[model samples]
Target chain A: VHLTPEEKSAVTALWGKVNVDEVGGEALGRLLVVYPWTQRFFESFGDLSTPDAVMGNPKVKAHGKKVLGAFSDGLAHLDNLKGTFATLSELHCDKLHVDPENFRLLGNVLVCVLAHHFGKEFTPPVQAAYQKVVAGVANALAHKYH
Target chain B: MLSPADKTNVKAAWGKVGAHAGEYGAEALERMFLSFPTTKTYFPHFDLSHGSAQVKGHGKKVADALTNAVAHVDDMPNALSALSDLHAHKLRVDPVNFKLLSHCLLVTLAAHLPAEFTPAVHASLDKFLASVSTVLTSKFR
Candidate 1:
């Protein structure tokens, strides 16, 4: 679970290029399209009945920004993921009863979104470092379940 | 990324599991559902109770896949290519659950085959499962 200094550098370096609004929106929309079952958690999101509707929905885009913003926070606190995510863990697991697996789902979707946008810049080593970060966030967010 | 020695170790361990691989798979799935309830979302229709035959049957399917994987250890992407499509497109299973199941499988093997589940074997088997997972989840676009 520990990130090497090189891994840390790789993640921090690339994360600077992320456009929270566009990337986050696409990642969230893709999550709904690729894994339709996740839409159940967002029934209130309104008219996500079709993939096009989901992509165009303003609410989805707004939440997507928030989702990517959370990832940014995670990037800043890579050294203390569990502690940083303690309240979020409780909110998702205890309060919302959101499936812990969703954390991993969203994390991977974020990775795909990054690779899609960054293309060649998302090299193997960079993707690998980002994966460790996502895994750490997912584990930290699922900690309350344990 | 399996080394020559890692491949040999995995093959030997799979040989030891042999016919009981299905049973081991069921135990691993059960352990995963019990330990990580979030995974149950993917198996809404199945009865997840202990010793359920349905679970055992699905376990056999998984065992068959692993057996196929071991048979084609050198080229997993081509080996599990169709399965990768079924899993990524139809099943739409999150890639993370693969790690959970892989972890559960390791624990099950350790409990059932104590003598053979040595450190070296564990490491090799872990790599093998990771490779399988990578292939299974590779098709997601």
Candidate 2:
């Protein structure tokens, strides 16, 4: 669970430049497009009957912002992730009722979007760091399910 | 292929994790399902909710399997022979899931036995679990 100094540097620098709202929307929208099974969790988003509709939907955009914001929150509190995500975990497990799988899917899509945006800067080392961060966040978010 | 020192470290760590292996196993499973939700595909019938008795029961089964592995560390393939078949043949679990669960198990061990989970012991236990994983997945074509 320990992020090395080098990883922290890559993660922090990349995070600093990320446009949370825009990237979050693309990530979530792409998640629904690529993994249709995930739409079951976001049934309330409306008109997800088609991929284009899902991508452009207002609700999808809004929730995407929230999702990316959560990732930002995770970035801010890397040292105590489980503690930071505890309430969100409860909400996801108990209240919102998302399949735990979706967190991982969204996390991957978020990273993919980052790679698309940052290109060469998102080197293998940076990608590795981001994957670790995403894994940590995903685990923290799902901790309450167990 | 653990060294003598690695074997000693693994054995000593397992000794500290002796009786509470069941709880540790359950926690590892819980962590695995949470962290790597794709692994849950192997347990469709079981209740995945937090603190499910079924999880606890399966956890004990998992712990028992690991105990057997510990007892015969040098002969892991023979020790886990049945489990290897069951997983590779009947369950058809992806080998990747074994790595995920092993990582979770290591985290659980590190969390519960902080003082005992030194870097060397951590590496030893990782190698032990990876060997176990290799044996369990050996039957896959």
Candidate 3:
């Protein structure tokens, strides 16, 4: 993946900020479980037709919409948590007493996943841009931590 | 025609209904297992004895969050964007598995709610499931 100069720069800025405590193992595990569940459910039984057609009866339609609204709200909560994690990583790199290099590598992985989720047209070029960030982080982690 | 006041009442009522969706989801799962034992392979941890209660709890949590969103739907985009970002970073589970689990949920619903699970019910559930999948995929997009 060949990254544009701008994408490379953005990733660099993100790398400069890495925090460990904010991205605890438990939180990461919960995220790992739920994220996949959402994807699996849709692949199995999702109907992309008109909302009414998919919903069946009027009552069910009404009920389903309400449920959907709630699920979306949960998604919003997840996003807020992500922002906090990102900021922590950037500011407390040294304060957390963790290797700055390893922190950045993990940060790169997260940024890749985040961009993909946001539907940011992850063309090969975009991927390349991200890859560059990952490589840089990997190098730093390798030198300092490993 | 429903008056504006009536519409507000309906929305409130739906909030209550949404709160029970997890119960419905769990019930749907149980029925799916009974009708199609083959589907059971997907969810090994699905405890039939406790599945209903668990789903109900999840449903209530979902409903509560949605009720809050309903009260503030206008400012939802930023919230959604943040969710997508967080999920992308912290949650990297496979989409294929999600589809399989959803299938089990639908089959269970159809089998259990014979009276309610008409063709129309199936269609509606299908749409509901799809919308959820879209949101999930959006994170990976």
Candidate 4:
């Protein structure tokens, strides 16, 4: 189920229509809901509780978008994957010291959000292509050094 | 100095630009490239022929960095200096070219978010943009 050239165009077209702000908000919010440990990771937001709470807080929300934007950036850079992925690697693995497993889960959360966002359009081929890319991103965010 | 209320307004406005950054930032960067063709020298991969993925993705990167800067508006210099340093030292990007980017972003933000984009945004974000452009070159200077 590789992303054929026509399939890539189709995927980018459909995915392009999806509102990134909504995706970032909901997907990131879902990340916390599905795995609350992230709330504690963001020590700056101070006593965060629910997804709605994190979304309301300006700093937290922006941070969430930055994280998701990087995911989008990572996904987009699949063509030039290695170069761009290095930054995510440095930021998460070396700098922040987040566990690799936790970083991996973000890919899962984003894929779930995207698949759900597309519904029936997220067919086996598109989903497979997405999984391939997301796995690379998660690994980049996890590995000790790229 | 991003005052309390200024931060409040800037935060909301900047966040508004995130969703459409791909389109807005691409147009902004495209404008920059056309206005100052020499800046094109920094990017070898981008076709700059218009409607290319490289153009769109890179433009969004520029905009995302700007929006992210607001989240740490409290420490404006240090906040942005990391990438500024990366660009300046590692990538050898022309630091003076930052002003060019700021000009383009102003146009992008103003065009996309007409209702939220106001005189106050022009003043405050310009100030923030001023600091960012200045700090971007400091390492080189």
Candidate 5:
């Protein structure tokens, strides 16, 4: 699970430009659209349907940034990823009660978003590397949220 | 480097500290944020000012990290690395914030476990905290 130094530079820079407010908003919007039941965890946001709607609602935007930021940080420290993800797993399992499948869906949607964001630069190798990273994160989050 | 006796005392005190984390963790968070308001910038969404739920809740998470990190003192560095990474890589936070909380935490512990809060116990816990600091801030400088 290694990205070339050049690839890391390209990806991290692109990621830095990806606005969490819009990027996170759209990605989370897609997740909610795909798995509407996951809406139970979102009480602050009355309903999240459109991109602008998702952005306008501050709570939804904040949560999306939190999850995406957590996953993004995983790129730097794979060894520390499990413990970091475990907190999310335990939180979902204990109180939030978000289904494990939904977390997996978030990872999938995150890949789609990243791929779209990278646009022309997302070569096959680049997509594969990031997809693998997100997959590891997805599996890590799935540890005990079942 | 804690001797056997000191490590035992540290663990013994942690059991009580862990139990009342819901209380003391809040105390520590309040003290840190109130004293140094700049720390609140890291958490812009939440009002971590005096007596807010966000302060108490996030404080509990910090408490959880330490309590859990100590469960495997032999492998403490790796176990707590992620907790440190969250601050370093993501938040771009001041590592001194941890020292501030550590001070508050020791205060909280002293208040809670008054009888067992001996100089030796403080020494062991300080040693453990130093290890935590070392591992957590490795990526910083």
Candidate 6:
């Protein structure tokens, strides 16, 4: 997807901190290119769902049944990452940590990717909300490091 | 300041957070509240001693969320935004309170997952938590 210069730079910087290799970085980059909202969806999943079930293996014959069960259980939304966030909040009486600076860097990259992929459909309010979140994260990260 | 040895210890503890999900999550949550009884104050509305279902429910929720989130580590924004909204609406709790909960959670983790909660891991989590708190606080507006 089309990354703004700032988003590109931020991702590059974050890559350094995470020690992501060229191949991994490229894979992420390509994914962003193809699915701009992927990162946000993924983060939502991390926040809302149970870690055990995601990593657990169900019986082969039960797989279809489980998927169906998940849908009935209101986990169908969690088929994507955003759904995970909703499920987790409902389950856990708390929230997950999203380091502000890292979030900003990540958010910018995703937003830019979304804008590039979806064109005008991405909308201005969503873009503004993204910026606001990024700013808040940057402030928190700065204070934290200081 | 974490000694080199302490750092190593904390790292091992963090690994367990990911490794021993079933036992670790609930155990850590319980021990943390026990160690710092003050931490339990946040859940004043709820009674932990008798609320096994509540505790288990929270534990399962966290387990699912963490697992799902990690699966898409590459796409952080959508995940985070969705998380922000969920926390904002469903939990209807304060961001500052989450920070306190995280503190208790980390302490519990350090005690139980002694192998993974190294000094480095603690430091990393500290940084992560601080940032997370800030972002959550912003969502208030």
| Best-performing candidate as measured by lDDT | 1
DockQ of each: 0.12, 0.04, 0.04, 0.01, 0.01, 0.03
Candidate 4's C-alpha runs over 4 A off are: A1-146
| Candidate 5 lDDT tens digits, B72-118 | 77777788878767655555444555676677778778888888899
lDDT of 5 by residue, A16-135 (tens): 777776777667876666544455457568756555565577777777888777767776676556777787767765555444556566878887887787777777876766666666
- Candidate with the greatest DockQ versus the true structure: 1
Model 4's CAPRI class is incorrect
lDDT of 4 by residue, A1-146 (tens): 23567656765776677777677776566566555676667777664574457556676566767777777776576666557777667776677777777766666566556655554465434544565666676666655464
- Residue A32 lDDT in model 1? 89
Q: Distance (Å) between predicted and true CA of B34, model 5?
A: 2.5
Q: In candidate 3, which residue ranges exceed 4 Å CA deviation?
A: A1-146, B1-19, B26-56, B62-83
Runs of candidate 2 exceeding 4 Å displacement:
B1-141
Stretches of candidate 5 off by over 4 Å are A1-146
The TM-score, computed over Cα atoms with residue i paired to residue i, of candidate 5 is: 0.47
Q: How does chain B of model 5 score on TM-score? A: 0.87
Question: All candidates: CA RMSD in angstroms?
Answer: 7.7, 9.9, 19.8, 20.0, 15.3, 18.2
- The residue pairs that clash in candidate 2, if any, are none
Better of 2 and 4 by lDDT: 2
**lDDT for A67 (candidate 3):** 30
**Cα TM-score of candidate 3:** 0.31
Scored by TM-score, the top model is 1
Which stretches of candidate 6 lie above 4 Å from their native place? A1-146, B1-15, B31-47, B72-74
Q: Where is model 1 more than 4 Å wrong at Cα?
A: A1-53, A57-98, A103-146
Indicate whether candidate 1 or candidate 3 has the larger TM-score: 1
lDDT accuracy of residue A128 in candidate 4 = 47
* lDDT per residue as tens, model 2, A1-146: 47998899889988899888999899999988876656656777789878889989989999999988877977888998999999999887666656566778788898889989999999999999999988899889888874
* Steric clash count of candidate 3: 24
Output the better candidate (1/4) by TM-score: 1
Order by lDDT, highest first: 1, 2, 5, 4, 6, 3
